[PDB]
From a paper:
Adeno-associated virus (AAV) is a small ssDNA satellite virus of high interest (in recombinant form) as a safe and effective gene therapy vector. AAV’s human cell entry receptor (AAVR) contains polycystic kidney disease (PKD) domains bound by AAV. Seeking understanding of the spectrum of interactions, goat AAVGo.1 is investigated, because its host is the species most distant from human with reciprocal cross-species cell susceptibility. The AAV5 clade also includes AAVGo.1 (18, 19), which was isolated from deceased neonatal domesticated goat ileum.
Cryo-EM single particle analysis (SPA) yielded a reconstruction at 2.9 Å resolution for AAVGo.1. The structure of AAVGo.1, solved by cryo-EM to 2.9 Å resolution, is most similar to AAV5. The AAVGo.1 capsid has a similar protein fold and surface topology to AAV5 structures. The capsid core, comprising a jellyroll fold found in many virus structures, and a single α-helix (αA), is the most conserved feature of AAVs, and AAVGo.1 is no exception. The AAVGo.1 core jellyroll has the standard topology with a backbone chain alternating between two stacked antiparallel β-sheets (almost rolling into a single tube). AAVGo.1 and AAV5 capsid proteins have high homology (94%). DE loop (VR-II), which forms the outer edge of the pore-like structure of the 5-fold axis, protrudes an additional 1.5 Å compared to AAV5. A double serine insertion in VR-V of AAVGo.1 leads to two dislocations of 2.1 Å and 3.0 Å in the carbon backbone compared to AAV5. In conclusion, AAVGo.1 amino acid differences account for displacements up to 3.0 Å in VR-II and VR-V compared to the atomic structure of AAV5. AAVGo.1 residues Thr477 to Ser482 are of below-average order in the sharpened maps of AAVGo.1 alone.
Numbering used by the authors:
A (entry chain A), B (entry chain A), C (entry chain A): 209 to 726
Write the structure that this text describes.
């Protein structure tokens, strides 16, 4: 439209309206010129002594928008206002918009950089609606709209790993190359704006409630069962039985079973550091799966377990999600202690899921004769059994919203190990890059031009989601537990900028606070 | 209708029409008089030293039509034209028709056989629409319309095993006898024709595409994760963490897991014969399940694995489908080398399923103290876990189309271990027999007549199926892999008759050629 | 319909109606069971010392109907009545019909054959409408409806050669196998009949007239030309000219040129046998073309030449069509003298085409200086030049009607070297075979049945063509030449059966009798 006329406004709010809440977030982004407008074949061999780190892929000159973290849509006070009052929620719509673009031309002429703004330069933008490109948004990768609205962020570079050969850095005949210029983009100059809308498929609500009943204590503790149980054998080998009394839950007949489990190791946090074994490189002793002759660590393991038992300091670290209070810089290989790290705890599920560092149970190892005695054998892993129930991992303010389910054809219970909603058709990926502008060419050459003017672009992005809520209707009498701002001797305010202007976040707020009778 | 007037024509073609293809095949069959028009109680005791080979059942005087193999509807050139251009397909309809029947009366009088044609003899035909009879069509049994149209085939005899007692050849009180004359058939003389139509329930498409991304390399290899991971313990027992860098897929947090697995043994094909252990009777060392006190080999194991790792000669033979190039005769107990055998390979799934001869992974065996060190224990079998994905076995031109799901009431993921579509109500079984004509009886006898005129029948059968296709829409740039007629120094043409007139087929054409970004 | 009711009548006549003539011919055929209902891969290596005789192909169990010879539609008296009165003709329609079928079952039981007729057996019939099969009808092959209506004929076996490798009997990766059962046929029992109609594309008339003017004598022989011609050089090197007088056709300026030519060798017929060189194996000294490293004799050479010069006994045998008076048996490798052979002569074209055993002309070999003298060099081959005219080979009563033009994409002047009409879509091929009836099978076997009852079929075929004629309108005064029954001391009547009942034909009647002023 016009140079001296704004393309859009800054909308950033929330609007609770009964069983729906619409959130809105605007942010300023900056897009570098990655790979000097080229495609490069990136590849790696086995690093760290693990050929699972060996890949082969392509880095493109595009950047993408990632809105896959909760704190990109919710403020800490609107999150709290949700987890204290509702039993669940699920996304219903999405509507992204890019506007107020500005392309800047950088020039380092004379060992001195001068930033002037180009008014005729464009920016390319397209959304992958049919899922024809490798999805990279739902894998816990950095680069999402910052948590704090004032913060400006750089868009991350697009790239993807494709099939490599024999755990090496070479390709196979099936390795594919996707050209992103082969998609119909839209071009934008300073006066234009891009819009895009989407609507989620039905997905089941997330359950933001914790159970207030043990799964193996569902029976009435006053009435006895009309069922008997084999208790022992007499001297005559004759089998004897005994009735299941009331309150004796160790012996009652059950109807439902806890869910899957896979033992991990447990490590004690600070308080008990003394107990933990000294100097142990976990890699060698971690839970790992093999895929094509390579060993990959499967953190955070499949759903159906609790990393900790409420009341203890021991932790199943490989079944845990570990974030970082203070954001970090790319390429950091520094070793950090637990202090500035937010170890999430899923213990409000202990009533239904099993601890990840204990044996799942015991079963029989043989057959008793007039000779051999009955023997039991504890097991460390048990998968899904018919009639089992479990609770899924919880979502955090600083955690991921959705994940894309791989379209292989067959899958069981599509719920991402990192929490969130599993989707067959998740929000499209929105790529963007700066259309290249050639330097001073002066003669023909069937060779492509490699001299480009260095540029970068800035702009705003507004993303407005709509969520559906599930009202809590409990007849609990006494008061419940809520998420509260409980600090002692505060030297700073949490979820707010400190003296220098850097945003602080010392807590990981989850979602399971309210309760429900199993 | 009439003797000197044909009941139907010979339709045999294919007709591609966008997202649908209709195939049609006609063939000539011959029906012997099995069991001299009687029902016999067939039974066997433990043979080969395995009481699992002990059964009890009934052989009937009926024969049936089996269209449960792909190469009964597709030519090698129409198969190829499908697997190179589509991402999947599924059957939509069926329409069988029997016509141009001819009953012949054989007579060996005077040590010399004279074949004359009986014009008044009938043939009985009925389709089991309610699934009231034991289904025997989807179990990989011979007897299907030949691959080559010119070939004439004999219909196989119907029979079934019912409950036997204590792994013996005796019946139980629950053993059932089904009388097939107790169904309303239709009778046909030379001028009549039988028709029958059917339509499949919705079934999910088969996925004829291979993934072009590893399941554990879905993250962007340029951006790092905002998650940390327990890496080791300090001398103070204090736990230390480290950030998940980019491209280090051995350590990233994953969202999805590979599918089920059950270790089988792996044997090296020719090239590596030297490595294989010498003289091993597999039975004793094979994967077996127990059902009622008997050990059965479970080949080809459940879905979710790859029999081989692309680039190697090693094979998980018990997880493999093994066909035969040159068709064989009934009762052959000869030992064959790999040469004339088509060992199918499911490696275009290696990116998502695990190899069947490697350990599935490692997990923890204990709990580390200030005393005990962390220990891991490799596992050989792991079943379905929540959030796992796998790809189903592929279909072959020479393999089965569908299978009937047992109507027990409870089942998980109904997909036949041998590939194809699992159906609750599969195409009805079509039985047929020659109505008996008595010899010269001359006096009453309350005893049934046992003297019959020997006869046989011939005729044509046309089966026309309709399939639905799933168009491929990929934005891959470089060229894909296709199924091509790549032979070197051909001494004969494949998929064509040789000097003597015998049909040759040296390859097993599968379905997974195209690719898709996971 | 019915057994005791005829399917069709015997129509065999001609009906002249102005500018159209409709011919009709019925005949009785017999169809053997070729290849015992099988497909065989036929192949040959280099035979006769020529690797051009090495092929690789397939013989099928089908037979076909061939109506590609003129004497299958015309009687000698209706042919004569055409070539004496019209200036040309061309086919307009076609309409074949098969009826009154009868399948017979042969039995050699007891060293004694008994032919009984099977009333339930069928016969399969289909026409290749889209030209998807190798066409073999227009290559001068035997097997066409006999010349004489009373004669019964056996249908010839279908087969075709496909690509062979390096002039050997092995196939290439491109060698194709066509299954004829893969086409939708129609089945016929004794009471049924098959019909089929077709209409030719526009094709230019054949020109059944000879020119009555030399191509180089078109000018008026009374008037002189206003053009001069370089005649010589004076002693001064000065060039001199002279006017083109009247009647001096050796020197006139011409406007049109004779057509293509390629010198062959000329051999004298009987009268001059003495002159011919003694004992010469032509193969080594014949006109041959090379295609893929093999030498093939190109008889009868391309159009545009006359095999003989009217008034001489010399013959360009390789540019000649040689038929046989008395029909012969298959596999005869006997050497025959000219006597019972009909050597066609194309001399009524000598006014426009050049003799095939003379040098085509002379041209210049150098450049004359004050030193070198002018030299000429006779040429033996000259192809098409702009502004050239020629006349095509003539058609004979015993010769072919049409030919199919290969669908390569590029071609020049599509007129078959053997005469007739070149067609892009010629009359479809009509294949037919006896549906197989199995012997006494008694047990299942996944192996195809190989025991068949020996049968053969008989029936009638009526083919009715419509032709368009071009009326002659000449203002010639004196009488023309006609084809007349001019024999002297006839010991038998020509074109009629002799004492034994064998049809005689001592002449090859062509088509060029009438004349036209060039």
């Amino acid at each position: 439209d016009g140079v001296g006329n704004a393309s859009g406004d800054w909308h950033c709010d929330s609007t609770w309206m009964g069983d729906r809440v619409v959130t809105k977030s605007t942010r300023t982004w900056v897009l570098p010129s990655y790979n000097n407008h080229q495609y490069r074949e990136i590849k790696s061999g086995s690093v760290d002594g693990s050929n699972a780190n060996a890949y082969f892929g392509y880095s493109t000159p595009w950047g993408y928008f990632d809105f896959n973290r909760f704190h990109s849509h919710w403020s800490p006070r609107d999150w709290q206002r949700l987890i204290n009052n509702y039993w669940g929620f699920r996304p219903r719509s999405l509507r992204v918009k890019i506007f107020n673009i500005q392309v800047k031309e950088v020039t380092v002429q004379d060992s001195t950089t001068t930033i002037a703004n180009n008014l005729t330069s464009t920016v390319q933008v397209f959304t992958d609606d049919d899922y024809q490109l490798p999805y990279v948004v739902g894998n816990g990768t950095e680069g999402c709209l910052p948590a704090f609205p004032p913060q400006v962020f750089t868009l991350p570079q697009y790239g993807y790993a494709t099939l490599n050969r024999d755990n090496g850095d070479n390709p196979t005949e099936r390795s594919s190359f996707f050209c992103l210029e082969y998609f119909p983009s839209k071009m934008l100059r300073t006066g234009n704006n891009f819009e895009f809308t989407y609507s989620f498929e039905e997905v089941p609500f997330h359950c933001s409630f914790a159970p207030s009943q043990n799964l193996f204590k569902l029976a009435n503790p006053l009435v006895d069962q009309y069922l008997y149980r084999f208790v022992s054998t007499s001297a005559t080998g004759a089998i004897q039985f005994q009735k299941n009394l009331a309150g004796r839950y160790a012996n009652t007949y059950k109807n439902w079973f806890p869910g899957p489990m896979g033992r991990t190791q447990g490590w004690n946090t600070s308080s008990g550091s003394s107990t933990n074994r000294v100097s142990v490189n976990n890699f060698s002793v971690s839970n790992r799966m093999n895929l094509e002759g390579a060993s990959y660590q499967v953190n955070p393991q499949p759903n159906g377990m609790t990393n900790t038992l409420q009341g203890s300091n021991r932790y199943a670290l490989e079944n845990t999600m570990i974030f970082n209070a203070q954001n970090a810089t790319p390429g950091t290989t520094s070793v950090y202690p637990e202090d500035n790290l937010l170890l999430t705890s899923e213990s409000e599920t202990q009533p239904v899921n099993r601890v990840a560092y204990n044996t799942g149970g015991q079963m029989a190892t043989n057959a008793q004769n007039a000779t051999t005695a009955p023997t039991v054998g504890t097991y460390n892993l048990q998968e899904v059994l018919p009639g089992s129930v479990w609770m899924e991992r919880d979502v955090y303010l600083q955690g991921p919203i959705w994940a894309k389910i791989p379209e292989t054809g067959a899958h069981f219970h599509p719920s991402p190990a990192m929490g969130g909603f599993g989707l067959k058709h998740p929000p499209p990926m929105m790529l963007i890059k700066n259309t290249p502008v050639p330097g001073n060419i002066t003669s023909f050459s069937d060779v492509p031009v490699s001299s480009f003017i260095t540029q970068y672009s800035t702009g705003q992005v507004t993303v407005e989601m709509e969520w559906e809520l599930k009202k809590e209707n409990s007849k609990r009498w006494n008061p419940e537990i809520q998420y509260t701002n409980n600090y002692n001797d505060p030297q700073f305010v949490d979820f707010a900028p400190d003296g220098s202007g850097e945003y602080r976040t010392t807590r990981a707020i989850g979602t399971r606070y309210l309760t429900r009778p199993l």
